[PDB]
Amino acid sequence: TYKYVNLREPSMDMKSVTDRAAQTLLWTELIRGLGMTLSYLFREPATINYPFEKGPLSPRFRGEHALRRYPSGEERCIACKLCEAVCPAQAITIEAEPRADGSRRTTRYDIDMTKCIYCGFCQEACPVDAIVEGPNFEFSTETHEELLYNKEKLLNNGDKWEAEIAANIQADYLYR
Amino acid sequence: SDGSSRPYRCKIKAPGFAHLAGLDKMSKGHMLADVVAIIGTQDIVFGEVDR
Amino acid sequence: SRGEYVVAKLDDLINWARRSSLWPMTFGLACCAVEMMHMAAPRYDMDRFGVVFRASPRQSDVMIVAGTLTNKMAPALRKVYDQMPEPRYVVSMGSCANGGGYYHYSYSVVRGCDRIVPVDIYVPGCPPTAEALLYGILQLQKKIKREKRLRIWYRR
Amino acid sequence: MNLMITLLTNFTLATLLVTIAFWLPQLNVYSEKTSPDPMGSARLPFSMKFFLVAITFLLFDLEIALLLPLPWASQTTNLNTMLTMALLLIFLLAVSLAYEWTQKGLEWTE
Amino acid sequence: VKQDMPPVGGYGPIDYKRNLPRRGLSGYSMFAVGIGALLFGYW
Amino acid sequence: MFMINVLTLIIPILLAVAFLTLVERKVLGYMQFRKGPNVVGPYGLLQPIADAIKLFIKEPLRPATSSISMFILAPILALTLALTMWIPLPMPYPLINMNLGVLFMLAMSSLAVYSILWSGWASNSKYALIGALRAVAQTISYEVTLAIILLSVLLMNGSFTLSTLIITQEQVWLIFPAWPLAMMWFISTLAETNRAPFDLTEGESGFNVEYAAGPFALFFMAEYANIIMMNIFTTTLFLGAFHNPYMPELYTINFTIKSLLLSITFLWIRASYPRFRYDQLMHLLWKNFLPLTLALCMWHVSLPILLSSIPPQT
Ligand SMILES: CCCCCCCCCCCCCCCCCC(=O)OC[C@H](COP(=O)([O-])OCC[N+](C)(C)C)OC(=O)CCCCCCCCCCCCCCCCC
Ligand SMILES: CCCCCCCCCCCCCCCCCC(=O)OC[C@H](COP(=O)(O)OCCN)OC(=O)CCCCCCCCCCCCCCCCC
Ligand SMILES: CCCCCCCCCCCCCCCCCC(=O)OC[C@H](COP(=O)(O)OCCN)OC(=O)CCCCCCCCCCCCCCCCC
Ligand SMILES: CCCCCCCCCCCCCCCCCC(=O)OC[C@H](COP(=O)(O)OCCN)OC(=O)CCCCCCCCCCCCCCCCC
Ligand SMILES: CCCCCCCCCCC1=C(C)C(=O)C(OC)=C(OC)C1=O
Ligand code: SF4
Ligand code: SF4
Ligand code: SF4
Numbered sequence: 001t002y003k004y005v006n007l008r009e010p011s012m013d014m015k016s017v018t019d020r021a022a023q024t025l026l027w028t029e030l031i032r033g034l035g036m037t038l039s040y041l042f043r044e045p046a047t048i049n050y051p052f053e054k055g056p057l058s059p060r061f062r063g064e065h066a067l068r069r070y071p072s073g074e075e076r077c078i079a080c081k082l083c084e085a086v087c088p089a090q091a092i093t094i095e096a097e098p099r100a101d102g103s104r105r106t107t108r109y110d111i112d113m114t115k116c117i118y119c120g121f122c123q124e125a126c127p128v129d130a131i132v133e134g135p136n137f138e139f140s141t142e143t144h145e146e147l148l149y150n151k152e153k154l155l156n157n158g159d160k161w162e163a164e165i166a167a168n169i170q171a172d173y174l175y176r
Numbered sequence: 177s178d179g180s181s182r183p184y185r186c187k188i189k190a191p192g193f194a195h196l197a198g199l200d201k202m203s204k205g206h207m208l209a210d211v212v213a214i215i216g217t218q219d220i221v222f223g224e225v226d227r
Numbered sequence: 228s229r230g231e232y233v234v235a236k237l238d239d240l241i242n243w244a245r246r247s248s249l250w251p252m253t254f255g256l257a258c259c260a261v262e263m264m265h266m267a268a269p270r271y272d273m274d275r276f277g278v279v280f281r282a283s284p285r286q287s288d289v290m291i292v293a294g295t296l297t298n299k300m301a302p303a304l305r306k307v308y309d310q311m312p313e314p315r316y317v318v319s320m321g322s323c324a325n326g327g328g329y330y331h332y333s334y335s336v337v338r339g340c341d342r343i344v345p346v347d348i349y350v351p352g353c354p355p356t357a358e359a360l361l362y363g364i365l366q367l368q369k370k371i372k373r374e375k376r377l378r379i380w381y382r383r
Numbered sequence: 384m385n386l387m388i389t390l391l392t393n394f395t396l397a398t399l400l401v402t403i404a405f406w407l408p409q410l411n412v413y414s415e416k417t418s419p420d421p422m423g424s425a426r427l428p429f430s431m432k433f434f435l436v437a438i439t440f441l442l443f444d445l446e447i448a449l450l451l452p453l454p455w456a457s458q459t460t461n462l463n464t465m466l467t468m469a470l471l472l473i474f475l476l477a478v479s480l481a482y483e484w485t486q487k488g489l490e491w492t493e
Numbered sequence: 494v495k496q497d498m499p500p501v502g503g504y505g506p507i508d509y510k511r512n513l514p515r516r517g518l519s520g521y522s523m524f525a526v527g528i529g530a531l532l533f534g535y536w
Numbered sequence: 537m538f539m540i541n542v543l544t545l546i547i548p549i550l551l552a553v554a555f556l557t558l559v560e561r562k563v564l565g566y567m568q569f570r571k572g573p574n575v576v577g578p579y580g581l582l583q584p585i586a587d588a589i590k591l592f593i594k595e596p597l598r599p600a601t602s603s604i605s606m607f608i609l610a611p612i613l614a615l616t617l618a619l620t621m622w623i624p625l626p627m628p629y630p631l632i633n634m635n636l637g638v639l640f641m642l643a644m645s646s647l648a649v650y651s652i653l654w655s656g657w658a659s660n661s662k663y664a665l666i667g668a669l670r671a672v673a674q675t676i677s678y679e680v681t682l683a684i685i686l687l688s689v690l691l692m693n694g695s696f697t698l699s700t701l702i703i704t705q706e707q708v709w710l711i712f713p714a715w716p717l718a719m720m721w722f723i724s725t726l727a728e729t730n731r732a733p734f735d736l737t738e739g740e741s742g743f744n745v746e747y748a749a750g751p752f753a754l755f756f757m758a759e760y761a762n763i764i765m766m767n768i769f770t771t772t773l774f775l776g777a778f779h780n781p782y783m784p785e786l787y788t789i790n791f792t793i794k795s796l797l798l799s800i801t802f803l804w805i806r807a808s809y810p811r812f813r814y815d816q817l818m819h820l821l822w823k824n825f826l827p828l829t830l831a832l833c834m835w836h837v838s839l840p841i842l843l844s845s846i847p848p849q850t
Contacts, residue, residue, distance in 0.1 A: 015520075022520035026527070027719075030809070037808045041567045047272040050361055055270065089322075089329050114326025114339065117353040140350045140363040142370065144341055147325065147351055209813045212740060223257055244589035247576045269570035274561065276575050277583060285597065286749055288590075312595035312749065313413045385538050386632050389623055392542050397615035401608065404750030408596050416598070420661040420741070427662050433673055436818075440676045447683050451639070453837060454690050458849045466841055473834045480826060492673075493819035527715070534713025535843065 059168040062120045062133040065111050065149070066158040066165060075155070076130035079106045083122035083131050091115035092122065109151040114144065124176070134161045135168060190224035230381060238377040245288070245314060246371035247277045249364070252287035252311075254304065256294020259321035259354045263293050266357035278364060289316040289367065291360075292344075295323035295330060296337045308344045316371075318348045318363055325349050432492050439483060446476050545631055546619055553760045554584035560803045567807050588753070596748035599659065606654035611747075611754045614651040617644055618758035621765050626699045626772065628779045628787040637698040638690065641769065642683060645728070648762075649675050651755070652743050659746040668743035670814060671730065677818065678727045681825050685721045688833040689714055689773060691840060694847030698772065702787070704847065705776030717832055718774045720825055725766045727817065729759060732806035739811050767798040 010016065023029065048055065069075050079096035095108035122131050134157065141147055149157075158165070178184040195218040202218075203211045251273075253263050267273045267280050274280055284290075284307055296304060308317070319340050322328030327338040340346060347370065350363040450472055459465050483489055518526070558580055562572030573580030601607045621644050624630045624637030634640055649672050656668020690696065692713065693704050704710065711718045727734040737743060744755055768791070775798075777790035812820070840846050 018520035018524075020520075022523050026523055028517060028523075033808050034804060037567055037804065040569060041563075043569065045272075045566065045570050046269045047275065047571045048270060050271060050358070051365070055356075055358055089331065112326065113351050114322050114349075115328060115331050117322060117329045119353075137352070137356055137359050138362040140348060140359065140366055142348060142366075144326070144339070144346070144349060147349060207813060207815065208740070241589070241593060244586045244593070247586045248583075248590040269568065272565070272570045274565055275571045275573055275580075277573050277586065285745060286594075286752065309416070309418065312597065314595075386623070388538065389542050389632065390620065392539070393546065393616050393619040394612070396546060397612050397619065400615065400754060401611050401751065404592065404611075404754055405596070405608075405748070407592060408594065408748075408750070411593075411595070413595050420663040422662055425662065427665065433669055436673050436677065440673075440680060443680050444683075447680070447687075450684075450687060453687065454694060454696070455849070457691065457837075457840070457846055458694075462841055466838060469837045470834060473830055473837070477827070477830050480822075480830070484823070489818070489822050491815060493815050493823055530712055530715060534708060534710075534715075535839070 057135065059135075059171040061135050061137075061168075062118050062123075063137040064134050064139050064157060064161075065113075065116075065122075065154060066132050066134045066161055067109070067151070067154040068130055068132055068158050068162070068165065075105070076128045077106055077109065077126075078104050078128060078130070080127065082125045082127070086121045086125040087116075088119060088121065089115045089117050091117075106151060109154060111149045111154065113147040113149060129169065132158075132165050132169070134165050136161060188224070188227055190227065192218070192220045192222070192225040196220060196225055231378070234377040234381045238375060241377070242372050242374050246368040249276075249278050249289050249316075249368065249371075250282040250287045251278060251289045251291055252282055252284050252307075253291045253293060254307075256292075256296070256300070257321075257323060259293035259323070262354040262357060263291065263320065263360060266360050268357070271357045271361055273361070273364070276364070276368075284310065285312075287311060288314065289318055289364075290344075291318045291320055292324040292340045292346075293320040295328070296340045296343065298335045298337060301337050301343050304340070305343050316348075316367060317344050317346045318350060318367060319346045320350045320352075320360060320363075321355055322351065322353045325351060328353060432490075435488065436492055439488070442479070443476070446472070446479075450476075541631055545622060549619065549622065549761055549764070550757070552764060553757050554588065556760050556764065556799070557587070558583050559800075563800065563803050564807050567804070591749050591753045594749035596750070597746060598748075599746040601658050601746070602660055603658050607658040610651045610654040610658065611751045611758070613654070614648075614755055614758040617648050617651070618761040618765070620644060621762075624698050625765075625768060626702060627791070628699075628702060628784050630698060633699065634697070636696040638686060638696040642686065645682065646676075646679055651758075655747065655755075656743045659744070661741065661745060663741040664743060664745050667737055667741045671737060671743055674734070674736070674814070674817065675728065675730070677821055678724050681720065681724045681821065681829050682728060684826075684829045684833055685717050685724065686773075688829070688836045689717055689721070691836050692847060694849055701772055702776055702779050706778075709775055711774040714774070714836070716828070717836075720829060721773070722770065724825070725770060726802065726805065727821075729762045729766055731763065731802060733809045733811045734817055736811065736814060736817075763802060764795070764799060767802065768795045771795040771798055 010020070067075065067077060079094060081094050081096075084090075084092035084094050091112045093108065093110040094106055096104065096106050099105045118133070120133050123129075123133050136157075199214065199218065202214045206214070253260060255263075265271075290308060290311060292304070308315070317340075319325050323330065323336075324340045327333075327336055330336040331338055337343065348363050348367045350360055352359050355363075450469075453469055456465050456469075517523075558573070561583070562580060565572035573583045576583045576586055599607075621641055623632040624634040624640060630637065652668050652671050652675065656665045656672075659665070689710070692710065693701055730737065744752055747755065771791050771794045775791075775794050777787050777794065779787040
């Protein structure tokens with residue numbers, strides 16, 4: 001149930017005493033450390049060649065946000081405001097009105113990528129799989145204002161990354 | 177909790193708080209390098225300390 | 228003419244020298260500093276790009292703000308930024324340094340490190356992966372490459 | 384003759400490198416900086432330990448200056464006298480070290 | 494049903510104890526080696 | 537004609553220093569399960585050039601120095617004393633053949649601490665001055681054991697001449713009769729050039745915190761030249777090579793290989809162990825190295841008399 005780390009008494013016979021004194025005078029454990037670091041020199045390093053080689057990822061990965069569409073061109077978001085209600089950082093702003101054919105669609109859908117904590121609550125609170133967190137992560141910008149996405153930017157991200165987002169959703173949707 | 181869906185109070189007790197409090201007693205009669213070793217031997221993450 | 232060609236080649240030389248020896252200093256504030264340490268790990272190897280590990284503040288080129296900048300920490304950040312020799316660059320890592328992030332509406336958190344220092348590269352994430360910070364560093368190198376200091380000096 | 388030529392060459396190469404290292408960013412017109420140690424204006428505290436180790440080094444250096452001509456002195460005919468004097472000098476070195484050791488001279492910088 | 498499960502026989506052995514090889518000669522042997530090197534050099 | 541010899545001595549020193557920076561970065565990387573620089577050039581062969589140009593176009597610090605005279609003079613002394621400790625080195629023929637080259641080297645090494653002292657005093661920071669004083673004390677305290685070890689080793693040589701040191705080891709290496717002196721000499725030279733595990737100024741202010749990036753690079757280059765020089769001196773002292781008087785290239789290649797291996801051992805040492813405390817290294821010197829150095833000095837005075845093996849004076 002417990003064990004005694006560092007409760008080993010040293011032996012006081014001449015063999016142990018001479019072993020300890022030879023270890024003191026000739027620096028045995030220093031040679032041990034040197035030799036093992038030398039052994040670690042002759043191994044193949046674990047370095048991958050970025051950007052030509054990428055680290056492994058999973059279909060559950062949470063990167064850049066995107067707005068999806070039905071397989072007929074119609075967008076999936078129906079302005080239910082669950083994603084902005086569940087957002088722990090209040091990064092989502094939604095404004096809605098009935099459009100020309102009477103459908104319930106958003107007129108404003110902003111996500112602040114500097115407020116968002118990339119927690120994935122919005123993509124799991126969506127009843128229609130409209131908002132997703134895509135697999136893209138290399139989207140660093142040179143300006144603060146480029147990280148304030150409107151509806152058009154998110155729709156463009158969805159149209160850009162649909163061919164990967166749909167495959168990731170197909171791979172993962174049976175675990176939800 | 178007061179019965180609603182949001183907590184009324186949430187105090188977080190972290191061990192780094194007490195260890196950094198005891199750092200004064202730890203580092204008495206030691207050197208500067210012993211001070212940095214004493215800081216190291218307490219697992220101190222200041223996210224849990226300052227909260 | 229000849230002078231424009233000379234200043235163009237000299238500009239390419241100095242930009243290659245500056246962008247291929249970026250010595251960073253890192254503000255170890257919060258989670259994003261642990262992810263910076265993970266980019267300095269053997270897998271991603273910040274050193275192989277000419278980007279050393281934990282250089283001194285008095286000789287660094289790029290300053291990385293990885294974590295939350297509180298009200299008690301902001302004057303120290305400005306004091307460290309002011310002592311850096313030029314050319315100096317600032318990379319903002321994670322949402323806390325980008326715009327405040329989770330603690331944006333807090334009473335003791337500065338809403339973005341761009342309210343204190345000028346920022347060149349914004350790395351989004353919470354935390355952004357080591358891949359993402361490496362991408363931000365390489366994008367900073369691309370930004371340094373297309374500088375035109377000597378051409379601007381010649382034209383003025 | 385050649386030695387002082389080499390000395391002058393090393394000195395002028397070092398001063399050339401230092402001049403280029405100083406005055407080349409002086410030709411840049413970067414900016415003007417205002418800039419308004421952990422101790423702010425504290426006086427340097429006088430420590431007896433650093434002075435003690437400095438004086439101990441100086442005295443041991445003097446006895447080293449005494450010990451230096453041993454390779455030349457080993458060629459003498461009077462080998463017993465030279466051996467006795469050499470052993471006596473190094474024994475005096477050891478005795479001074481032991482007196483510093485026992486009276487807590489090497490304390491907190493051991 | 495299909496789930497992420499351990500096998501029927503479980504997994505193989507996994508070590509958790511300290512492993513230090515205790516290699517090299519004894520104190521007497523290394524002292525003898527050093528003294529022999531000194532004697533060869535002096536000769 | 538002699539200036540050609542001087543130039544071909546001093547320019548490859550700077551080239552070897554820059555490629556020592558590259559080699560140390562790459563070797564530490566491969567010893568820490570990663571890679572060194574391999575992007576700037578083919579296997580990082582262009583890294584020192586880029587780093588040097590970047591450091592020579594960096595903004596200066598422009599400090600409020602108490603004395604601009606010694607602020608100038610400290611890198612002057614550091615570089616001059618780094619370059620002037622190569623001229624009596626036999627390769628296998630020294631550039632300046634000195635009758636007392638060993639003691640000339642000891643004098644220059646003892647004179648080398650004024651750069652630390654003046655760099656510490658020129659900076660207005662008092663903590664920088666305290667760090668400089670501690671570094672100076674460590675440096676002189678290891679000068680003591682350097683002098684005793686060199687004196688005791690030279691009793692098998694017979695003179696202070698560096699060229700005779702090849703002749704002495706014509707039969708066997710000098711590490712065979714003086715290996716405890718070799719170990720203590722290696723550790724003392726490791727602590728002499730302020731290298732790990734004795735580089736206290738990098739552990740918790742350096743003596744040159746207020747120095748500009750250019751002069752800091754000059755100081756660091758002087759330190760690396762000191763490292764290469766000390767390793768070559770150690771190779772000459774304890775690992776002497778076979779010198780054919782008709783083919784000097786044999787000796788040149790042999791001691792070049794041995795000194796490169798010793799410098800790689802320096803870099804191997806610097807990435808294996810934690811740093812010492814100040815009092816711990818003072819304890820290691822004044823209470824461990826010094827008594828054994830004195831005992832071995834008495835042993836190596838009294839030994840060639842009792843063996844009828846006094847080396848010739850000339
Ligand atoms: C140039 C050639 C290569 C040289 C070696 C290079 C590779 C090895 C590198 C090793 C690691 C280096 C980094 C760490 C350096 C700092 C640590 C260090 O060196 O500490 C030294 C340590 C320090 O000792 P310490 O601190 O452990 O001692 C304990 C002291 N108290 C208890 C007070 C705390 O050891 C020494 O100083 C010993 C020096 C060498 C002794 C040689 C003795 C020779 C044999 C004599 C005879 C013995 C038999 C008995 C008498 C018989 C008579 C007939
Ligand atoms: C004692 C020995 C000491 C040795 C020290 C040096 C060791 C390393 C030696 C060099 C190793 C290889 C370096 C190769 C550099 C890159 C060369 C190259 O191809 O550059 C291409 C680049 C862009 O070319 P561009 O025309 O734009 O391409 C479009 C065409 N598809 O074009 C450019 O960037 C412009 C041209 C650059 C040419 C660079 C050539 C190498 C420079 C090396 C400097 C040091 C040389 C040795 C000095 C000491 C010995 C004399
Ligand atoms: C009057 C006319 C002359 C005027 C003055 C100019 C003198 C010559 C200056 C150097 C040549 C000018 C061009 C400089 C490079 C421009 C082209 C360039 O950007 O090439 C990029 C290429 C590497 O591409 P990169 O973007 O790094 O990609 C990473 C891999 N994915 O880069 C490469 O392949 C390597 C580039 C090497 C550049 C040349 C070698 C370094 C400089 C040597 C001379 C100066 C220093 C001498 C030594 C000083 C002491 C250290
Ligand atoms: C802040 C100021 C500037 C600081 C930086 C520059 C100065 C410090 C760094 C350089 C130090 C140089 C030291 C020069 C003396 C070293 C001893 C010496 O010369 O030894 C060599 C040799 C004696 O050996 P030996 O073999 O016996 O002579 C030939 C016998 N057949 O002796 C000879 O061969 C003698 C040759 C003739 C005499 C030469 C005299 C040289 C000039 C005087 C000293 C110059 C330095 C002055 C400043 C010192 C430091 C402040
Ligand atoms: C004549 C001038 C030659 C060039 C100057 C010396 C070589 C450049 C050293 C630069 C450098 C490198 C590469 C370097 O890697 C390093 O990190 C340990 C430094 O110290 C912080 C350096 O100063
Ligand atoms: S991932 Fe989380 S923090 Fe980000 S927008 Fe979605 S719910 Fe908000
Ligand atoms: S949860 Fe889905 S459907 Fe509801 S408002 Fe958000 S994105 Fe639209
Ligand atoms: S952005 Fe996220 S990961 Fe980074 S410091 Fe803030 S809370 Fe931590």
